[PDB]
Design a protein around this ligand. Structure first.
Ligand code: NAG
Ligand code: NAG
Ligand code: MG
Ligand code: MG
Lengths: 181, 15, 178
């Protein structure tokens, strides 16, 4: 489809956690979602939150419809469960790597299904738990998912990093290595 | 209100 | 693997040259099984699983009336709002050149994604030796891109990476002397 811009509400429900998600993306970047637990709209940037609003009940009402529709399709499909599609993983820094200068490492996990995933940052074999963040499970036009994980870090010639990824389509956890080279 | 974005309403399946 | 069933919905608005096209997609696992496309004007079953749903939805006049109105009532409305904010987002690229033989023009933290990055050697544009990544989406409403030039340095050569972007008054350049 020809388009200068694509604006998409994307939502899903499923048996396992996360059991629901309701978000809006503009040109493939997530602009807001509805936190279904807190029943509140969450804007990605302050630029958006100050200008825009969205009634969270609109997200909750749509998720209720999807959950009903999921129950129907489980019956109509004779409980068809899809094959697991394992993720592709890439790790790259946000800024040019300068030893001793603060940076952000990004782990992009792509082309996987279902949207059930465990991700851990490792540094020299050990989990890093501070200075981390992550995206939602983001939609793809082929109905698989992708996701971003972030780690604040100070680059150093020594350190080896891993983005360790767990998914049902994998024979064992996937460790994608990165070093400042 | 701020500038309010509009929703769409998903349709209920026939069960 | 554990028992797991997934259902997805999408409501997509395609803005192009003043027009709005609306698709609403119903997906079981990864099988799109029914959809409404405003170019089409009614629901269609995408697979056999969608035949009951398309038939039923297409029999409800109020639903078709609502969906046929979405381009003008929902898509155009939200697009006008995004014209006031999202489409005015401008984050200026940072530019760094470093050697790797390649010279790397690393352009970071910019928005929107459309950008032109060009290499010049002694004032002459160099294209045949340019290996570019794709645009890299960072997921945080910024992009980056690495535009690398295959190079054979010789003393005196002056390389310049020039970046053009809507956020800039004028193109920005970084020079590297061999
Ligand atoms: C993720 O980790 C949890 C433990 O916190 C475990 O119960 C679950 O099986 C893991 N999921 C996957 C997909 O490996
Ligand atoms: C944009 O729309 C106008 C109709 O108002 C049409 O004449 C023109 O060809 C369109 N431009 C493109 C690039 O399709
Ligand atoms: Mg709000
Ligand atoms: Mg190239």
């Amino acid at each position: 489809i020809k388009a200068d811009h694509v604006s998409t509400y994307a939502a899903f429900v499923q048996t396992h956690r996360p059991t629901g998600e309701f978000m809006f993306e503009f040109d493939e970047d997530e602009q807001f979602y509805v936190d279904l637990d807190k029943k509140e709209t969450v804007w990605h940037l302050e630029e958006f939150g100050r200008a825009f609003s969205f009634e969270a009940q609109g997200g909750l009402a749509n998720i209720a419809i999807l959950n009903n529709n999921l129950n129907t399709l489980i019956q109509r499909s004779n409980h068809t469960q899809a094959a697991n599609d394992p993720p592709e993983v890439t790790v790259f820094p946000k800024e040019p790597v300068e030893l001793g200068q603060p940076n952000t490492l990004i782990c992009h996990i792509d082309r996987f299904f279902p949207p059930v995933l465990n991700v851990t940052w490792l540094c020299n074999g050990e989990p890093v738990t501070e200075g981390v963040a992550e995206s939602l499970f983001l939609p793809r036009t082929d109905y698989s998912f992708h996701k971003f994980h972030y780690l604040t870090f100070v680059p150093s010639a020594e350190d080896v990093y891993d983005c360790r990824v767990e998914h049902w389509g994998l024979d064992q956890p996937l460790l994608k290595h990165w070093e400042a080279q | 209100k701020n500038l309010e974005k509009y929703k769409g309403k998903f349709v209920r399946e026939i069960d | 693997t554990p028992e797991n069933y997934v259902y997805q919905g999408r409501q997509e608005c395609y803005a192009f040259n003043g027009t709005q096209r609306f698709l609403e997609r119903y997906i079981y696992n990864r099988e799109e099984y029914a959809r409404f496309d405003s170019d089409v004007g009614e629901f269609r079953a995408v697979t056999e699983l969608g035949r009951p749903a398309a038939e039923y939805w297409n029999s409800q006049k109020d639903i078709l009336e609502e969906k046929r109105a979405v381009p003008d009532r929902v898509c155009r409305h939200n697009y006008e709002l995004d014209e006031a904010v999202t489409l005015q987002r401008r984050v200026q690229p940072k530019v760094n050149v470093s050697p790797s033989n390649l010279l790397v023009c690393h352009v970071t933290d910019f928005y929107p994604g459309s950008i032109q990055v060009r290499w010049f050697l002694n004032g002459q544009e160099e294209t045949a030796g340019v290996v570019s990544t794709n645009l890299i989406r960072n997921g945080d409403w910024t992009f980056q891109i690495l535009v690398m030039l295959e190079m054979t340095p010789q003393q005196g050569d002056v390389y310049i990476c020039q970046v053009e972007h809507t956020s800039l008054d004028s193109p920005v350049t970084v020079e590297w002397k061999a």
